[PDB]
Design a protein around this ligand. Structure first.
Ligand SMILES: [Mg+2]
Ligand SMILES: [Mg+2]
Ligand SMILES: [Mg+2]
Ligand SMILES: [Zn+2]
Lengths: 69, 122, 100, 124, 49, 55
RNA sequence: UUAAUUGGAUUCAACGCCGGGAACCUCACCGGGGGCGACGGCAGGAUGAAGGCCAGGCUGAAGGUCUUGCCGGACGCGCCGAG
Protein backbone atom coordinates (compact mmCIF):
# COMPACT_ATOMS: atom_id res chain seq x y z
CA UNK A 1 0.00 0.00 0.00
CA UNK A 2 1.02 3.58 -0.72
CA UNK A 3 0.54 4.61 2.92
CA UNK A 4 3.27 2.25 4.16
CA UNK A 5 6.37 3.57 2.37
CA UNK A 6 8.76 5.82 4.27
CA UNK A 7 8.79 8.66 1.72
CA UNK A 8 5.40 9.18 0.08
CA UNK A 9 4.76 12.02 -2.36
CA UNK A 10 8.38 12.82 -3.15
CA UNK A 11 9.38 16.47 -3.14
CA UNK A 12 10.98 16.36 -6.58
CA UNK A 13 9.26 13.75 -8.75
CA UNK A 14 6.01 13.60 -6.78
CA UNK A 15 5.94 9.81 -6.59
CA UNK A 16 5.81 7.41 -3.65
CA UNK A 17 9.28 6.11 -2.80
CA UNK A 18 11.04 3.90 -0.28
CA UNK A 19 14.70 4.60 0.46
CA UNK A 20 17.34 2.61 2.35
CA UNK A 21 20.84 3.26 3.72
CA UNK A 22 22.96 5.83 1.84
CA UNK A 23 20.17 7.17 -0.36
CA UNK A 24 17.96 7.59 2.70
CA UNK A 25 20.73 9.44 4.53
CA UNK A 26 21.42 11.80 1.65
CA UNK A 27 17.71 12.48 1.17
CA UNK A 28 17.34 13.48 4.82
CA UNK A 29 20.45 15.65 4.62
CA UNK A 30 19.07 17.29 1.48
CA UNK A 31 15.78 18.07 3.23
CA UNK A 32 17.60 19.74 6.11
CA UNK A 33 19.81 21.66 3.68
CA UNK A 34 16.74 22.92 1.82
CA UNK A 35 15.32 24.14 5.11
CA UNK A 36 18.62 25.87 5.88
CA UNK A 37 18.98 27.65 2.53
CA UNK A 38 15.68 29.54 2.81
CA UNK A 39 16.54 30.61 6.39
CA UNK A 40 13.39 29.05 7.83
CA UNK A 41 12.85 28.73 11.57
CA UNK A 42 13.45 24.98 11.57
CA UNK A 43 16.66 25.49 9.61
CA UNK A 44 18.02 27.87 12.22
CA UNK A 45 17.03 25.43 14.97
CA UNK A 46 18.87 22.64 13.15
CA UNK A 47 21.95 24.84 12.75
CA UNK A 48 22.10 25.78 16.42
CA UNK A 49 21.48 22.23 17.65
CA UNK A 50 18.31 23.16 19.56
CA UNK A 51 14.94 21.39 19.84
CA UNK A 52 12.86 21.82 16.71
CA UNK A 53 9.31 20.72 17.60
CA UNK A 54 8.42 23.30 20.23
CA UNK A 55 9.80 21.90 23.47
CA UNK A 56 10.56 23.99 26.54
CA UNK A 57 14.28 24.52 27.13
CA UNK A 58 14.51 26.14 30.56
CA UNK A 59 14.57 22.91 32.58
CA UNK A 60 15.49 19.88 30.47
CA UNK A 61 17.68 19.33 27.38
CA UNK A 62 20.74 20.21 29.47
CA UNK A 63 24.01 18.89 28.03
CA UNK A 64 27.12 20.61 29.32
CA UNK A 65 29.01 21.41 32.52
CA UNK A 66 28.11 23.38 35.62
CA UNK A 67 29.07 27.05 35.73
CA UNK A 68 30.24 28.42 39.07
CA UNK A 69 29.33 31.70 40.73
CA UNK B 1 -34.06 89.47 2.26
CA UNK B 2 -32.05 92.70 2.22
CA UNK B 3 -33.12 96.35 2.63
CA UNK B 4 -31.18 97.20 -0.54
CA UNK B 5 -33.80 95.33 -2.57
CA UNK B 6 -36.79 97.56 -3.34
CA UNK B 7 -39.83 95.25 -3.31
CA UNK B 8 -42.41 97.47 -1.60
CA UNK B 9 -42.84 99.57 1.54
CA UNK B 10 -42.89 98.38 5.16
CA UNK B 11 -46.54 98.01 6.23
CA UNK B 12 -47.06 98.05 9.98
CA UNK B 13 -49.77 95.38 9.73
CA UNK B 14 -47.39 92.99 7.96
CA UNK B 15 -44.89 93.31 10.82
CA UNK B 16 -47.66 92.98 13.41
CA UNK B 17 -48.95 89.75 11.87
CA UNK B 18 -45.48 88.38 11.05
CA UNK B 19 -43.68 88.97 14.37
CA UNK B 20 -46.39 89.15 17.05
CA UNK B 21 -48.16 86.03 15.70
CA UNK B 22 -45.43 83.44 16.32
CA UNK B 23 -44.94 83.75 20.07
CA UNK B 24 -48.50 82.49 20.57
CA UNK B 25 -47.59 79.79 18.03
CA UNK B 26 -44.03 79.02 19.17
CA UNK B 27 -45.31 77.08 22.20
CA UNK B 28 -47.72 75.13 19.95
CA UNK B 29 -45.74 74.53 16.79
CA UNK B 30 -42.41 73.79 15.14
CA UNK B 31 -39.61 76.13 14.08
CA UNK B 32 -37.12 75.62 11.23
CA UNK B 33 -34.57 78.41 10.77
CA UNK B 34 -31.66 78.75 8.35
CA UNK B 35 -31.71 79.74 4.69
CA UNK B 36 -30.28 76.43 3.45
CA UNK B 37 -32.60 74.40 5.69
CA UNK B 38 -35.66 76.40 4.63
CA UNK B 39 -34.67 76.24 0.95
CA UNK B 40 -35.47 72.52 0.89
CA UNK B 41 -38.56 73.26 2.99
CA UNK B 42 -39.93 75.78 0.48
CA UNK B 43 -38.78 73.69 -2.48
CA UNK B 44 -40.78 70.71 -1.21
CA UNK B 45 -43.44 72.94 0.36
CA UNK B 46 -42.57 71.83 3.90
CA UNK B 47 -42.78 75.34 5.35
CA UNK B 48 -46.08 76.99 6.26
CA UNK B 49 -45.27 80.52 7.52
CA UNK B 50 -42.19 82.05 5.89
CA UNK B 51 -41.15 85.32 7.55
CA UNK B 52 -38.21 86.57 5.48
CA UNK B 53 -36.12 89.17 7.30
CA UNK B 54 -34.06 91.81 5.52
CA UNK B 55 -30.75 91.13 7.22
CA UNK B 56 -28.70 88.79 4.98
CA UNK B 57 -25.94 90.08 2.71
CA UNK B 58 -25.13 89.85 -0.06
CA UNK B 59 -27.85 88.92 -2.56
CA UNK B 60 -26.30 85.47 -2.95
CA UNK B 61 -28.30 82.95 -0.88
CA UNK B 62 -31.25 85.34 -0.54
CA UNK B 63 -32.02 85.50 -4.27
CA UNK B 64 -33.72 82.10 -4.09
CA UNK B 65 -36.96 82.70 -2.17
CA UNK B 66 -38.35 85.61 -4.27
CA UNK B 67 -37.57 83.63 -7.45
CA UNK B 68 -39.38 80.66 -5.89
CA UNK B 69 -42.37 82.69 -4.65
CA UNK B 70 -44.29 82.16 -7.90
CA UNK B 71 -43.44 78.44 -7.95
CA UNK B 72 -45.51 77.51 -4.87
CA UNK B 73 -48.08 79.04 -2.55
CA UNK B 74 -45.32 80.00 -0.05
CA UNK B 75 -47.35 82.34 2.21
CA UNK B 76 -44.57 84.75 3.16
CA UNK B 77 -44.21 88.02 5.05
CA UNK B 78 -41.28 90.34 5.69
CA UNK B 79 -39.51 91.18 8.95
CA UNK B 80 -37.94 94.59 9.72
CA UNK B 81 -35.25 93.42 12.16
CA UNK B 82 -33.44 90.22 13.13
CA UNK B 83 -32.24 90.70 16.72
CA UNK B 84 -35.62 89.90 18.29
CA UNK B 85 -36.64 87.64 15.40
CA UNK B 86 -34.75 84.74 16.96
CA UNK B 87 -35.99 85.69 20.43
CA UNK B 88 -39.60 85.71 19.21
CA UNK B 89 -39.26 82.16 17.88
CA UNK B 90 -36.09 80.19 18.52
CA UNK B 91 -32.95 81.06 20.49
CA UNK B 92 -30.93 84.17 21.33
CA UNK B 93 -29.18 84.48 17.95
CA UNK B 94 -29.76 86.43 14.74
CA UNK B 95 -32.48 84.75 12.68
CA UNK B 96 -33.05 85.14 8.94
CA UNK B 97 -36.15 83.01 8.27
CA UNK B 98 -38.20 81.29 10.99
CA UNK B 99 -40.56 78.84 9.30
CA UNK B 100 -43.35 77.47 11.51
CA UNK B 101 -45.48 74.57 10.25
CA UNK B 102 -49.04 74.08 11.54
CA UNK B 103 -49.19 76.73 14.29
CA UNK B 104 -51.69 76.58 17.12
CA UNK B 105 -54.57 79.08 17.09
CA UNK B 106 -52.71 81.34 14.66
CA UNK B 107 -55.04 81.05 11.67
CA UNK B 108 -57.24 84.15 11.35
CA UNK B 109 -54.53 86.81 11.57
CA UNK B 110 -52.06 84.88 9.40
CA UNK B 111 -54.71 84.18 6.76
CA UNK B 112 -55.83 87.82 6.73
CA UNK B 113 -52.28 89.12 6.37
CA UNK B 114 -51.59 86.53 3.67
CA UNK B 115 -54.61 87.75 1.70
CA UNK B 116 -53.46 91.34 2.28
CA UNK B 117 -50.04 90.51 0.85
CA UNK B 118 -51.67 88.69 -2.07
CA UNK B 119 -53.66 91.83 -2.88
CA UNK B 120 -50.59 93.97 -2.08
CA UNK B 121 -47.79 92.58 -4.27
CA UNK B 122 -46.83 89.10 -5.48
CA UNK C 1 -57.53 7.18 31.84
CA UNK C 2 -54.74 7.46 34.40
CA UNK C 3 -52.84 10.52 35.61
CA UNK C 4 -49.18 10.59 36.63
CA UNK C 5 -48.01 13.08 39.26
CA UNK C 6 -44.37 14.01 39.83
CA UNK C 7 -43.28 15.75 43.02
CA UNK C 8 -39.89 17.27 43.80
CA UNK C 9 -38.64 19.46 46.62
CA UNK C 10 -35.55 20.31 48.64
CA UNK C 11 -37.47 19.74 51.90
CA UNK C 12 -38.69 16.24 52.70
CA UNK C 13 -41.46 17.28 55.10
CA UNK C 14 -43.40 19.41 52.62
CA UNK C 15 -43.21 16.60 50.08
CA UNK C 16 -44.62 14.19 52.66
CA UNK C 17 -47.45 16.59 53.48
CA UNK C 18 -48.47 16.94 49.84
CA UNK C 19 -48.26 13.19 49.28
CA UNK C 20 -50.40 12.52 52.35
CA UNK C 21 -52.98 15.04 51.16
CA UNK C 22 -53.22 13.31 47.78
CA UNK C 23 -53.42 9.93 49.50
CA UNK C 24 -56.29 11.06 51.72
CA UNK C 25 -58.11 12.59 48.74
CA UNK C 26 -57.90 9.22 47.01
CA UNK C 27 -59.01 7.48 50.22
CA UNK C 28 -62.15 9.61 50.64
CA UNK C 29 -63.26 8.45 47.17
CA UNK C 30 -63.63 5.15 45.39
CA UNK C 31 -60.49 5.22 43.28
CA UNK C 32 -57.30 3.17 43.14
CA UNK C 33 -53.93 4.88 43.56
CA UNK C 34 -50.53 3.23 43.31
CA UNK C 35 -48.52 4.21 46.37
CA UNK C 36 -46.00 7.05 46.30
CA UNK C 37 -42.88 5.59 44.71
CA UNK C 38 -39.60 7.06 46.02
CA UNK C 39 -37.23 7.90 43.16
CA UNK C 40 -33.49 8.30 43.77
CA UNK C 41 -32.33 11.55 45.34
CA UNK C 42 -30.44 14.16 43.33
CA UNK C 43 -27.17 15.31 44.91
CA UNK C 44 -25.37 18.40 43.61
CA UNK C 45 -21.85 18.54 45.03
CA UNK C 46 -19.36 21.38 44.56
CA UNK C 47 -15.80 21.38 45.92
CA UNK C 48 -13.94 24.68 46.18
CA UNK C 49 -10.66 26.05 47.49
CA UNK C 50 -11.12 28.10 50.65
CA UNK C 51 -8.41 30.75 50.68
CA UNK C 52 -8.70 33.79 48.39
CA UNK C 53 -4.95 33.85 47.72
CA UNK C 54 -2.62 30.91 47.10
CA UNK C 55 -0.43 31.07 50.20
CA UNK C 56 -0.64 28.43 52.90
CA UNK C 57 -1.86 24.86 53.01
CA UNK C 58 -4.68 23.93 50.66
CA UNK C 59 -8.07 23.25 52.26
CA UNK C 60 -11.40 22.62 50.59
CA UNK C 61 -15.12 23.14 51.12
CA UNK C 62 -17.65 20.52 49.98
CA UNK C 63 -21.07 22.10 49.47
CA UNK C 64 -24.07 19.89 48.78
CA UNK C 65 -27.68 20.38 47.67
CA UNK C 66 -30.22 17.56 47.85
CA UNK C 67 -33.43 17.23 45.82
CA UNK C 68 -36.01 14.58 46.73
CA UNK C 69 -38.56 13.06 44.38
CA UNK C 70 -41.79 11.06 44.52
CA UNK C 71 -44.04 9.42 41.93
CA UNK C 72 -47.79 8.83 42.20
CA UNK C 73 -50.18 7.20 39.72
CA UNK C 74 -53.95 7.66 39.93
CA UNK C 75 -56.82 6.94 37.56
CA UNK C 76 -58.62 9.92 36.03
CA UNK C 77 -61.87 10.47 37.92
CA UNK C 78 -63.43 13.90 37.52
CA UNK C 79 -64.85 13.82 41.04
CA UNK C 80 -61.35 13.20 42.43
CA UNK C 81 -59.53 15.19 39.74
CA UNK C 82 -61.01 18.50 40.87
CA UNK C 83 -59.85 18.08 44.47
CA UNK C 84 -56.19 17.51 43.59
CA UNK C 85 -56.42 20.35 41.08
CA UNK C 86 -57.34 22.75 43.90
CA UNK C 87 -54.88 21.63 46.59
CA UNK C 88 -52.26 24.30 47.31
CA UNK C 89 -48.61 23.27 47.50
CA UNK C 90 -45.92 25.23 49.38
CA UNK C 91 -43.63 27.45 47.34
CA UNK C 92 -40.71 25.02 47.80
CA UNK C 93 -42.42 22.06 46.08
CA UNK C 94 -42.82 21.50 42.34
CA UNK C 95 -45.74 19.48 40.96
CA UNK C 96 -46.55 18.36 37.41
CA UNK C 97 -49.57 16.38 36.21
CA UNK C 98 -50.01 14.50 32.94
CA UNK C 99 -52.55 12.06 31.51
CA UNK C 100 -51.46 8.71 30.10
CA UNK D 1 19.06 21.56 -11.51
CA UNK D 2 15.88 23.48 -12.26
CA UNK D 3 13.03 23.80 -9.76
CA UNK D 4 10.23 21.24 -9.56
CA UNK D 5 7.71 20.92 -6.74
CA UNK D 6 5.94 17.63 -7.54
CA UNK D 7 7.31 17.17 -11.02
CA UNK D 8 5.92 20.53 -12.14
CA UNK D 9 7.92 23.51 -13.32
CA UNK D 10 7.33 27.04 -12.08
CA UNK D 11 5.34 27.98 -15.19
CA UNK D 12 3.03 25.00 -14.76
CA UNK D 13 2.46 26.10 -11.17
CA UNK D 14 1.62 29.61 -12.35
CA UNK D 15 -1.18 28.38 -14.63
CA UNK D 16 -3.10 26.51 -11.95
CA UNK D 17 -6.38 27.19 -10.21
CA UNK D 18 -6.31 27.59 -6.45
CA UNK D 19 -8.17 24.31 -6.00
CA UNK D 20 -5.75 22.48 -8.29
CA UNK D 21 -2.73 23.79 -6.39
CA UNK D 22 -4.14 22.79 -3.00
CA UNK D 23 -3.88 19.12 -3.95
CA UNK D 24 -0.07 19.42 -3.94
CA UNK D 25 0.51 21.24 -0.64
CA UNK D 26 0.63 19.40 2.70
CA UNK D 27 -2.52 18.72 4.72
CA UNK D 28 -2.34 21.85 6.87
CA UNK D 29 -2.06 24.24 3.93
CA UNK D 30 -4.77 22.39 2.02
CA UNK D 31 -7.17 22.77 4.94
CA UNK D 32 -6.25 26.44 5.40
CA UNK D 33 -6.92 27.19 1.73
CA UNK D 34 -10.11 25.12 1.75
CA UNK D 35 -11.58 27.38 4.44
CA UNK D 36 -10.78 30.51 2.43
CA UNK D 37 -8.75 33.61 3.20
CA UNK D 38 -9.35 36.15 5.93
CA UNK D 39 -10.13 39.72 4.80
CA UNK D 40 -6.64 40.94 5.67
CA UNK D 41 -5.14 38.23 3.49
CA UNK D 42 -7.56 39.29 0.75
CA UNK D 43 -6.23 42.85 0.87
CA UNK D 44 -2.63 41.65 0.91
CA UNK D 45 -3.26 39.41 -2.10
CA UNK D 46 -4.89 42.32 -3.93
CA UNK D 47 -1.80 44.45 -3.33
CA UNK D 48 0.47 41.62 -4.47
CA UNK D 49 -1.45 41.10 -7.71
CA UNK D 50 -1.50 44.85 -8.34
CA UNK D 51 2.28 44.91 -7.91
CA UNK D 52 2.61 42.00 -10.32
CA UNK D 53 0.54 43.87 -12.92
CA UNK D 54 3.15 46.65 -12.91
CA UNK D 55 1.46 49.13 -10.56
CA UNK D 56 2.00 49.97 -6.89
CA UNK D 57 5.77 50.47 -7.04
CA UNK D 58 6.11 50.81 -3.26
CA UNK D 59 7.43 48.61 -0.44
CA UNK D 60 4.94 45.94 0.63
CA UNK D 61 4.69 45.88 4.43
CA UNK D 62 2.29 43.61 6.28
CA UNK D 63 1.10 42.35 9.64
CA UNK D 64 -0.20 39.03 8.25
CA UNK D 65 2.34 36.58 9.63
CA UNK D 66 0.02 33.64 8.84
CA UNK D 67 -0.19 34.16 5.07
CA UNK D 68 0.76 31.13 2.99
CA UNK D 69 3.38 31.70 0.30
CA UNK D 70 1.91 31.14 -3.16
CA UNK D 71 3.69 30.59 -6.50
CA UNK D 72 2.53 33.94 -7.88
CA UNK D 73 4.34 35.71 -5.03
CA UNK D 74 7.78 34.56 -6.18
CA UNK D 75 10.20 37.34 -7.07
CA UNK D 76 8.93 40.07 -4.75
CA UNK D 77 10.17 41.44 -1.43
CA UNK D 78 7.85 41.66 1.57
CA UNK D 79 8.38 43.27 4.98
CA UNK D 80 6.84 41.15 7.74
CA UNK D 81 6.24 42.59 11.20
CA UNK D 82 8.18 40.74 13.89
CA UNK D 83 6.86 42.57 16.95
CA UNK D 84 8.76 45.84 16.67
CA UNK D 85 9.95 46.19 13.06
CA UNK D 86 9.39 45.01 9.49
CA UNK D 87 12.16 42.75 8.22
CA UNK D 88 12.73 42.20 4.48
CA UNK D 89 12.11 38.78 2.95
CA UNK D 90 13.09 37.93 -0.62
CA UNK D 91 10.80 35.16 -1.85
CA UNK D 92 12.56 32.18 -3.43
CA UNK D 93 10.82 29.36 -5.33
CA UNK D 94 11.58 26.88 -2.55
CA UNK D 95 9.45 28.92 -0.13
CA UNK D 96 6.18 27.68 -1.65
CA UNK D 97 3.89 26.28 1.02
CA UNK D 98 5.32 28.01 4.10
CA UNK D 99 3.96 30.74 6.34
CA UNK D 100 5.45 34.21 6.12
CA UNK D 101 6.13 34.31 9.85
CA UNK D 102 8.62 31.49 9.41
CA UNK D 103 11.07 34.02 7.94
CA UNK D 104 10.78 36.75 10.60
CA UNK D 105 12.23 35.63 13.95
CA UNK D 106 10.65 37.23 17.00
CA UNK D 107 13.36 36.54 19.59
CA UNK D 108 17.03 37.46 19.77
CA UNK D 109 19.70 34.78 20.06
CA UNK D 110 20.94 34.15 23.59
CA UNK D 111 24.53 34.75 24.74
CA UNK D 112 24.74 33.94 28.43
CA UNK D 113 26.63 36.06 30.92
CA UNK D 114 28.15 35.13 34.24
CA UNK D 115 25.68 33.54 36.68
CA UNK D 116 24.61 36.02 39.33
CA UNK D 117 23.94 35.85 43.04
CA UNK D 118 21.38 33.16 43.79
CA UNK D 119 22.23 30.93 40.83
CA UNK D 120 23.55 28.18 43.13
CA UNK D 121 22.80 26.96 46.63
CA UNK D 122 26.03 28.47 47.98
CA UNK D 123 25.49 31.86 46.29
CA UNK D 124 22.41 32.82 48.35
CA UNK E 1 -18.55 80.24 5.34
CA UNK E 2 -21.42 79.85 2.89
CA UNK E 3 -21.67 77.22 0.15
CA UNK E 4 -24.76 77.85 -1.99
CA UNK E 5 -23.98 78.47 -5.67
CA UNK E 6 -23.27 76.72 -9.00
CA UNK E 7 -27.04 76.40 -9.55
CA UNK E 8 -28.05 78.34 -12.66
CA UNK E 9 -30.49 80.88 -11.21
CA UNK E 10 -31.64 84.05 -12.97
CA UNK E 11 -34.21 86.75 -12.26
CA UNK E 12 -37.22 84.51 -11.60
CA UNK E 13 -36.03 81.11 -12.90
CA UNK E 14 -34.36 78.56 -10.64
CA UNK E 15 -32.79 75.40 -12.04
CA UNK E 16 -30.29 73.09 -10.35
CA UNK E 17 -26.97 72.08 -11.88
CA UNK E 18 -26.64 69.32 -9.30
CA UNK E 19 -29.47 66.79 -9.42
CA UNK E 20 -30.95 64.99 -6.43
CA UNK E 21 -30.64 61.37 -5.38
CA UNK E 22 -33.23 59.17 -7.12
CA UNK E 23 -33.53 57.36 -3.79
CA UNK E 24 -34.53 60.69 -2.22
CA UNK E 25 -36.43 63.82 -3.20
CA UNK E 26 -35.33 67.19 -4.55
CA UNK E 27 -33.01 69.51 -2.69
CA UNK E 28 -30.22 67.01 -2.08
CA UNK E 29 -27.26 67.71 -4.35
CA UNK E 30 -24.44 65.58 -5.73
CA UNK E 31 -20.80 66.62 -5.96
CA UNK E 32 -18.76 67.60 -9.04
CA UNK E 33 -16.45 64.61 -9.33
CA UNK E 34 -16.94 64.61 -13.11
CA UNK E 35 -15.96 60.96 -13.34
CA UNK E 36 -19.17 59.80 -11.65
CA UNK E 37 -22.09 61.13 -9.61
CA UNK E 38 -20.88 61.29 -6.01
CA UNK E 39 -24.51 61.79 -4.92
CA UNK E 40 -23.37 63.14 -1.57
CA UNK E 41 -25.06 60.42 0.50
CA UNK E 42 -25.87 57.40 -1.72
CA UNK E 43 -23.16 57.31 -4.38
CA UNK E 44 -23.58 56.27 -8.00
CA UNK E 45 -21.25 54.59 -10.49
CA UNK E 46 -22.63 56.06 -13.71
CA UNK E 47 -19.68 57.68 -15.58
CA UNK E 48 -21.31 61.07 -15.90
CA UNK E 49 -20.50 62.62 -19.28
CA UNK F 1 -17.43 57.21 13.73
CA UNK F 2 -15.69 57.88 17.05
CA UNK F 3 -17.79 55.57 19.24
CA UNK F 4 -16.73 52.50 17.24
CA UNK F 5 -13.28 52.75 18.86
CA UNK F 6 -14.65 51.75 22.28
CA UNK F 7 -16.86 48.74 21.56
CA UNK F 8 -15.51 45.23 22.15
CA UNK F 9 -15.74 42.23 19.84
CA UNK F 10 -18.56 39.83 20.80
CA UNK F 11 -16.56 36.69 21.56
CA UNK F 12 -18.30 33.36 22.08
CA UNK F 13 -15.52 31.20 23.57
CA UNK F 14 -12.37 31.71 25.60
CA UNK F 15 -11.76 33.15 29.04
CA UNK F 16 -13.05 36.52 27.85
CA UNK F 17 -16.58 35.31 27.10
CA UNK F 18 -17.64 34.68 30.72
CA UNK F 19 -17.75 37.02 33.72
CA UNK F 20 -18.98 36.63 37.28
CA UNK F 21 -22.52 37.99 37.52
CA UNK F 22 -21.78 39.34 41.00
CA UNK F 23 -18.30 40.89 40.72
CA UNK F 24 -17.40 40.86 37.01
CA UNK F 25 -14.13 38.95 37.42
CA UNK F 26 -12.63 36.80 34.67
CA UNK F 27 -11.03 33.44 35.30
CA UNK F 28 -12.12 30.97 37.96
CA UNK F 29 -15.79 30.78 36.97
CA UNK F 30 -17.93 27.87 38.20
CA UNK F 31 -20.00 26.62 35.26
CA UNK F 32 -21.79 23.70 36.91
CA UNK F 33 -25.54 23.45 36.25
CA UNK F 34 -25.75 26.97 34.88
CA UNK F 35 -24.14 28.84 37.76
CA UNK F 36 -21.96 31.77 36.71
CA UNK F 37 -20.04 32.74 39.83
CA UNK F 38 -16.44 33.16 40.89
CA UNK F 39 -14.96 30.70 43.32
CA UNK F 40 -14.65 33.68 45.65
CA UNK F 41 -18.28 34.78 45.42
CA UNK F 42 -19.75 31.29 45.64
CA UNK F 43 -18.32 30.62 49.10
CA UNK F 44 -20.03 33.58 50.72
CA UNK F 45 -23.45 33.13 49.07
CA UNK F 46 -23.71 29.34 49.14
CA UNK F 47 -25.87 29.13 52.31
CA UNK F 48 -28.40 31.56 50.83
CA UNK F 49 -28.80 29.29 47.81
CA UNK F 50 -29.52 26.30 50.05
CA UNK F 51 -26.18 24.49 49.99
CA UNK F 52 -24.82 22.99 53.20
CA UNK F 53 -21.62 21.36 54.42
CA UNK F 54 -22.84 17.97 55.58
CA UNK F 55 -19.37 16.41 55.52
C1' U G 1 19.27 36.83 28.08
C1' U G 2 15.77 40.30 25.97
C1' A G 3 12.01 45.62 23.11
C1' A G 4 9.26 42.88 26.87
C1' U G 5 10.50 38.08 28.72
C1' U G 6 4.04 41.37 33.88
C1' G G 7 3.43 40.53 39.05
C1' G G 8 2.78 37.90 44.37
C1' A G 9 4.82 33.79 47.66
C1' U G 10 11.35 31.71 50.08
C1' U G 11 12.14 26.55 56.64
C1' C G 12 8.18 23.51 58.61
C1' A G 13 3.74 27.21 56.93
C1' A G 14 7.35 29.48 48.74
C1' C G 15 8.30 26.22 44.21
C1' G G 16 1.36 20.98 39.33
C1' C G 17 0.58 27.43 44.71
C1' C G 18 -2.51 32.17 43.31
C1' G G 19 -8.17 26.77 41.28
C1' G G 20 -2.05 30.05 36.91
C1' G G 21 -3.65 23.16 31.44
C1' A G 22 -2.01 31.99 28.81
C1' A G 23 -2.41 30.66 20.31
C1' C G 24 -6.75 35.98 20.12
C1' C G 25 -9.46 37.44 24.76
C1' U G 26 -7.53 36.47 30.03
C1' C G 27 -3.29 40.87 30.52
C1' A G 28 -1.48 43.50 34.43
C1' C G 29 4.43 43.65 29.93
C1' C G 30 6.69 45.39 24.81
C1' G G 31 6.09 48.11 19.45
C1' G G 32 2.46 50.95 17.00
C1' G G 33 -2.73 53.32 15.94
C1' G G 34 -7.27 55.43 17.62
C1' G G 35 -11.29 57.20 21.46
C1' C G 36 -13.23 59.58 26.32
C1' G G 37 -14.09 65.49 30.43
C1' A G 38 -21.52 64.67 33.96
C1' C G 39 -22.10 69.76 36.00
C1' G G 40 -20.59 75.01 36.23
C1' G G 41 -18.90 78.73 33.65
C1' C G 42 -15.16 81.59 29.42
C1' A G 43 -14.14 82.37 23.12
C1' G G 44 -17.71 80.89 19.75
C1' G G 45 -22.57 79.57 17.26
C1' A G 46 -29.08 79.22 12.41
C1' U G 47 -25.08 84.12 8.14
C1' G G 48 -24.95 77.41 11.35
C1' A G 49 -22.31 75.06 16.41
C1' A G 50 -21.28 69.86 18.31
C1' G G 51 -21.44 65.83 14.91
C1' G G 52 -21.67 61.99 9.93
C1' C G 53 -20.44 60.28 5.04
C1' C G 54 -19.42 58.23 -1.97
C1' A G 55 -14.65 57.73 -4.17
C1' G G 56 -8.93 58.56 -3.67
C1' G G 57 -4.01 59.35 -0.92
C1' C G 58 -1.20 58.49 4.20
C1' U G 59 -1.49 53.64 6.74
C1' G G 60 -0.50 46.97 8.97
C1' A G 61 -5.84 48.46 7.96
C1' A G 62 -8.69 52.52 8.73
C1' G G 63 -13.88 59.64 6.93
C1' G G 64 -8.51 58.30 12.32
C1' U G 65 -6.55 62.27 9.09
C1' C G 66 -6.16 64.75 4.34
C1' U G 67 -8.06 65.54 -0.92
C1' U G 68 -12.78 66.12 -3.20
C1' G G 69 -17.98 68.38 -1.57
C1' C G 70 -22.43 66.54 0.38
C1' C G 71 -25.07 66.02 4.85
C1' G G 72 -27.64 67.88 10.40
C1' G G 73 -29.56 71.62 13.29
C1' A G 74 -28.02 73.70 19.26
C1' C G 75 -24.82 73.47 21.73
C1' G G 76 -20.01 74.52 22.86
C1' C G 77 -12.18 70.84 26.35
C1' G G 78 -9.95 76.08 21.88
C1' C G 79 -9.79 77.96 28.08
C1' C G 80 -10.50 77.45 33.54
C1' G G 81 -12.72 74.47 37.78
C1' A G 82 -14.74 69.84 38.50
C1' G G 83 -15.76 64.65 37.38
MG1 LIG H 1 -3.69 23.99 36.61
MG1 LIG I 1 -2.17 26.76 26.71
MG1 LIG J 1 -2.36 36.86 24.94
ZN1 LIG K 1 -17.33 36.68 41.70
Amino acid sequence: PRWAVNRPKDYETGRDLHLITAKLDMAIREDIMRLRRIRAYRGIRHELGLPVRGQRTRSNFRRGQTVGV
Amino acid sequence: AKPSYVKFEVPKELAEKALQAVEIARDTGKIRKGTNETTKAVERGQAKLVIIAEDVDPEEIVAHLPPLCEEKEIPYIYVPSKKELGAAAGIEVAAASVAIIEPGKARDLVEEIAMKVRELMK
Amino acid sequence: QKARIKLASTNVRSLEEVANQIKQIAERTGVRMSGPIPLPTKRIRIVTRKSPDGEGSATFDRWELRIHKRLIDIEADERAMRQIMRIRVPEDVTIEIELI
Amino acid sequence: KEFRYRGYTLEQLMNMSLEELAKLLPARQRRSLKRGLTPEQKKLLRKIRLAKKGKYNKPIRTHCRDMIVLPEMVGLTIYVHNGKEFVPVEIKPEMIGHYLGEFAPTRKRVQHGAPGIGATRSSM
Amino acid sequence: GQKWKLYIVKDGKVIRKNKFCPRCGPGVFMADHGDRWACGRCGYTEWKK
Amino acid sequence: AKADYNKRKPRKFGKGARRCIRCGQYGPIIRIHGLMLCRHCFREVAPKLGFRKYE
